[PDB]
């Protein structure tokens, strides 16, 4: 799989990630700025992978993961968290997420993750 859907309410964070993914070979299927959008885009783009920011407006990542799973129980979701946001990561994993990555990014780490998920 190679199409990616980046979800994060922070432009910069998207930018960065978009650059990493892209140089690593992946394709940026799309961008989402919140949970809702994340789901809408998901149904529309059928990304191969999804990266998920937890803390966003309107709808958080955890709920979005839950939603996507209901739509696609084979969805491939990596969750993004700051450090120490450990209790949230457990909840996202439990909810569906295959793995997580910390912010601010570490291209090596980011890439590995993306690859295992494939």
By CB under 5 A, tell whether 37 contacts Mg ion.
no
Q: Which is nearer to Mg ion, 12 or 74 (CB)?
A: 12
By CB under 5 A, tell whether 31 contacts Mg ion.
no
CA distances, 86 to each of 53, 54, 55, 98, 101 (Å): 13, 11, 13, 15, 11
Residue 42 neighbours by CB under 8 Å, 6+ apart: 5, 50, 68, 71, 72, 75
How many residues touch Mg ion (CB under 5 A)? 3
By CB under 5 A, tell whether 9 contacts Mg ion.
yes
By CB under 5 A, tell whether 48 contacts Mg ion.
no
Flag whether 53 is marked binding: yes
CA distances, 53 to each of 40, 59, 115 (Å): 16, 11, 19
The DSSP code for 72 is -
Flag whether 63 is marked binding: no
Ranges within 53-92 binding Mg ion (CB under 5 A): 53, 55
**Residues binding Mg ion (CB under 5 A):** 9, 53, 55
Can you say which residues are annotated as belonging to the binding site for Mg(2+)?
Answer: 8-9, 53, 55
């Amino acid at each position: 799989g190679k199409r990616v859907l980046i979800v994060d309410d922070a432009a910069f964070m998207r930018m960065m990630l978009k650059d990493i993914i892209t140089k690593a070979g992946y394709e940026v299927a799309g961008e989402a700025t919140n949970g809702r959008e994340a789901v809408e885009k998901y149904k529309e783009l059928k990304p191969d992978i999804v990266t998920m920011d937890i803390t966003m407006p309107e709808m958080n990542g955890i709920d979005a993961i839950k939603e996507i799973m209901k739509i696609d129980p084979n969805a491939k979701i990596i969750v993004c968290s700051a450090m120490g946001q450990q209790a949230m990561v457990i909840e996202a994993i439990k909810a569906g997420a295959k793995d997580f990555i910390v912010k601010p990014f570490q291209p090596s780490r980011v890439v590995e993750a993306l690859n295992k998920v494939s």
